[PDB]
Design a binder for this molecule. Structure first.
Ligand SMILES: COc1cccc(-c2cc(C(=O)O)ccc2Nc2nc(N[C@H]3CCN(c4cccnn4)C3)c3ccccc3n2)c1
Ligand SMILES: COc1cccc(-c2cc(C(=O)O)ccc2Nc2nc(N[C@H]3CCN(c4cccnn4)C3)c3ccccc3n2)c1
Ligand SMILES: [Cl-]
Ligand SMILES: [Mg+2]
Lengths: 143, 139
């Protein structure tokens, strides 16, 4: 089976955050299955405990975790803490345009290898995801 | 015990009196590892952390590992608070989250859903009763 990618963004993302999440998930599918694609596409049905166990099972199964961290979210932050504890390969994408500052706990978790945080402008997100996987692919290129 | 108070930078800036009240009541029960962060200079809107991001990340991580209990104010959405609760669950810490539903917020399913009702508890409260609730938990 293809690689498993985990995409993580704020469930309270606004209209603009939502179009960016759809762009990121759509591009990630070129690299494998996006486990959270239906959640990104949508009492929460199934209830909070079920949701927590499902995202934990998907985080643990992931080959890579890609989080959009522009909007503050306890959920995105919690999933990044569980992902670092699972020693996963993590990429955070943050848009500095709003002038809001990314939490020091996320910027400060970066080690430039396994945990990376990249500032980006909305227009270049597809090109930056291609760059990230071209530098360290999940599947080897054909000859 | 060594107690870890976890709250957000936005929460600390807007709800300073509440954060001071929670930290003050926790001192009755033990040492509060984040006592010099919670109601200290938290900078202003748009400002980067004065102390350096990696320094901050490593210091909070060191205090989290040493803590006997993590008490988090989860009313304000924060990637930092969420991240610290994720690291603390992976460290098998006893965790109490305090949420204020009068704010109008809906607490993330990932925090409400992490509750196991004993080791990780989430309590909805109104600001006026926080001292009585911390007394209840520690007694
Ligand atoms: C936008 O792209 C994503 C992608 C991955 C994770 C998340 C996510 C974010 C948050 C967060 O930001 O706090 C919380 C839970 C998340 N995960 C999730 N959320 C499911 N349902 C949602 C319907 C509304 N909702 C709410 C509403 C208010 C409060 N908390 N949760 C949760 C869900 C259903 C079935 C199976 C697995 C699920 N997993 C978001
Ligand atoms: C309010 O009560 C608390 C209690 C415990 C943790 C936290 C906290 C929250 C967040 C978060 O919500 O994202 C991030 C880091 C935190 N921890 C921390 N923050 C220090 N300084 C602050 C000055 C403003 N600041 C900023 C400003 C913009 C962006 N990110 N961080 C970080 C700090 C200094 C020295 C030693 C240890 C430190 N540790 C807050
Ligand atoms: Cl600081
Ligand atoms: Mg595989």
């Amino acid at each position: 089976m293809r690689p498993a990618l985990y995409f993580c963004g704020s469930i309270r993302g606004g209209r603009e955050d939502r179009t960016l999440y759809e762009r990121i998930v759509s591009r990630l599918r070129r690299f494998g299955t996006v486990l959270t694609e239906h959640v990104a596409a949508a009492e929460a049905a199934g209830g909070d405990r079920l949701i927590h166990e499902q995202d934990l099972e998907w985080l643990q199964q992931a080959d890579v975790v890609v989080a959009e961290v522009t909007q503050p979210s306890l959920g995105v932050g919690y999933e990044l803490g569980r992902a670092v504890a699972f020693n996963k390969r993590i990429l955070c994408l943050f848009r500095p345009q709003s002038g809001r500052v990314l939490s020091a706990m996320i910027r400060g978790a970066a080690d430039g290898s396994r945990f990376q945080v990249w500032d980006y402008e909305e227009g270049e997100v597809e090109a930056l995801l291609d760059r990230y996987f071209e530098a360290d692919p999940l599947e080897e290129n054909l000859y």
